[PDB]
């Protein structure tokens, strides 16, 4: 069964502020499967979100990042007039610094060819052929990625912190995000377990599906 594609991630600053945290930019410790899936779609230049349902993603967290709070005069749609001071609101947003993680992509469950794994591979062998827009980022648009490269299981030859689906875990990461409200958002309960393996344990293969 073809070896799943592995990507090495290194983002200086990132924030995956949780859903129900709309008053505060408080973030998940780990990139959620939905955000990673969206970033992979951006890398392969896939605007449609339903194109690559079924791809299984597993995240290995190389180093636990530090959580820091920053202030931002974020703009909101409260008043019809743009210049009205009610739009600008000062609030805190948490960020994760020096995030290094490895991503496993298993696109065997995809029913549409070419699969996401093939698209990512072909993108990496021939960067000039792939046509897309924007700048690759994880989380917020201004949080660019320092390094995303094809890597093996031995790239750090170290000890890995995996995200494992546990029904009694702490983190509640969403694998499908409903941006308008919260109807279609689907959550899974995870945990961070420190294990010395170069391959993900079964559960880690968080498999993205449509909310239906």
């Amino acid at each position: 069964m073809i070896a799943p594609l592995i990507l090495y991630l290194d983002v200086p600053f990132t924030t995956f502020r949780e859903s129900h945290a709309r008053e505060m930019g408080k973030t998940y410790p780990v990139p959620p499967p939905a955000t990673v899936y969206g970033m992979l779609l951006s890398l392969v230049g896939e605007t449609n979100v339903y194109r690559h349902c079924g791809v299984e993603l597993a995240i290995a967290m190389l180093s636990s990042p530090k959580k820091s709070r920053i202030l931002r005069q974020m703009r909101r749609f409260k008043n019809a007039d743009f210049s009205h001071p009610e739009n600008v609101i000062p609030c805190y947003q948490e960020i994760l610094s020096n995030l290094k993680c490895l991503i496993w992509v298993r696109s065997d469950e995809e029913k549409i060819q070419p699969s996401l794994r093939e698209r990512i591979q072909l993108a990496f062998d021939h960067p000039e052929l792939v046509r897309r827009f924007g700048c690759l980022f994880l989380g917020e648009s201004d949080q660019l990625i320092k390094t995303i490269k094809l890597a093996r299981e031995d790239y750090l030859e170290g000890v890995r912190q995996w995200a494992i689906r546990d029904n009694r875990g702490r983190l509640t990461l969403p694998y499908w995000v409903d941006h308008v409200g919260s109807r279609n958002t689907r959550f899974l309960r995870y945990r961070i377990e420190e294990m010395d393996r170069l391959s993900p344990p079964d559960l880690a293969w968080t498999m993205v599906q449509s909310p239906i």
């Binding site: 290194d10 200086p12 600053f13 890398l43 530090k66 820091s68 709070r69 920053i70 202030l71 931002r72 005069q73 749609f77 743009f82 210049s83 001071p85 000062p90 805190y92 960020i95 610094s97 020096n98 993108a123 960067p127 000039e128 792939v130 046509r131 897309r132 827009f133 924007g134 700048c135 690759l136 980022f137 648009s141 201004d142 949080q143 660019l144 990625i145 320092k146 390094t147 995303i148 490269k149």
Partner: protein, 285 residues
């Protein structure tokens, strides 16, 4: 054929209290967070630098939808229906709405103080025999250099000629929002690491690193040099300019290192001219 322009830029050494955060009655805390090795560094928000670029674009022609009323200290919007084909700001920084939206063609991380932050503050009691409240203010400041990283997809631009004004703006960055009255900190580049490639990933995000607390040498980080020597991050697409060029030329074996065959200029303007010529040739301007 996608074309990008990423860049890590390091500012000069000076006294800065730029962004700040919510005060505690006393003290105006410069916001800070963890960085390499867990040492606390002072940050400057990404929106701050984007606001600085917007102000630069507005200050020199270059029609802006989001005009900044200096007298009223408010943001007036000329045309509620954003038109990226006409307004430079909607073309670059994008917009949001309830067509529907446009992802900004510019993404920059938050600036980071090159040296860890130490407890530094400034007394601020106001002159006068009468000593009422609103006196003895404290302004936390920092004497370091700020280094921030940006990336633009030139292809995503509606007008491909708009890359050049952004280059002039980043070179002549007017002012990041800060206590210019107390701490006038210039943000013009002092050492640049640019790369103009069709590859989506550039491994040059934060290459300036010195640590060595309370110092200004600002050597190039070892990991960046190792990455250059490895074979990836192609030196032909690299552009190195600024004061770091002196230290690079004083490095041993540099005449034989792969970093030698990268575009290297002491003069910043010569760097900008060469890069702009390359960009114009490749984009057909």
């Amino acid at each position: 054929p996608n074309y990008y322009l990423y860049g890590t830029v390091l500012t000069r050494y000076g006294l800065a209290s730029l962004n700040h955060d919510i005060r505690r009655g006393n003290k105006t805390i410069l916001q800070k967070g963890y960085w390499n090795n867990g040492k606390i560094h002072s940050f400057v928000g990404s929106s701050a630098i984007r606001w600085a670029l917007r102000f630069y674009l507005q200050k020199q022609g270059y029609l802006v939808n989001r005009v900044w009323d200096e007298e009223e200290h408010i943001n007036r919007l000329t045309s509620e229906d954003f038109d990226p084909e006409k307004f430079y700001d909607d073309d670059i920084f994008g917009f949001a709405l309830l067509p529907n939206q446009r992802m900004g063609a510019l993404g920059m991380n938050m600036a980071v103080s090159l040296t860890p932050y130490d407890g530094a503050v400034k007394l601020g009691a106001k002159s006068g025999r009468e000593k009422d409240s609103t006196s003895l203010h404290f302004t936390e400041y920092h004497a370091t250099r700020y280094q921030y990283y940006f990336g633009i997809d030139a292809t995503h631009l509606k007008d491909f000629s708009r890359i050049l004004p952004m280059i002039d703006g980043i070179m002549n960055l007017p002012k990041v929002g800060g206590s210019s009255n107390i701490f006038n900190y210039p943000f013009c580049p002092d050492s640049l690491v640019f790369q103009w490639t069709n590859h989506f990933a550039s491994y040059i995000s934060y290459c300036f690193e010195y640590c060595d607390p309370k110092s200004k040498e600002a050597k190039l980080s070892q990991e960046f040099i190792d990455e250059v020597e490895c074979g990836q991050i192609d030196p032909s697409k690299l552009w190195i300019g600024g004061t770091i060029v002196k230290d690079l030329q004083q490095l041993d074996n540099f005449e034989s290192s792969p970093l030698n065959k990268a575009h290297i200029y002491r003069n910043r303007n010569e760097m900008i001219e060469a890069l702009k010529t390359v960009i114009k040739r490749d984009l057909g301007l």
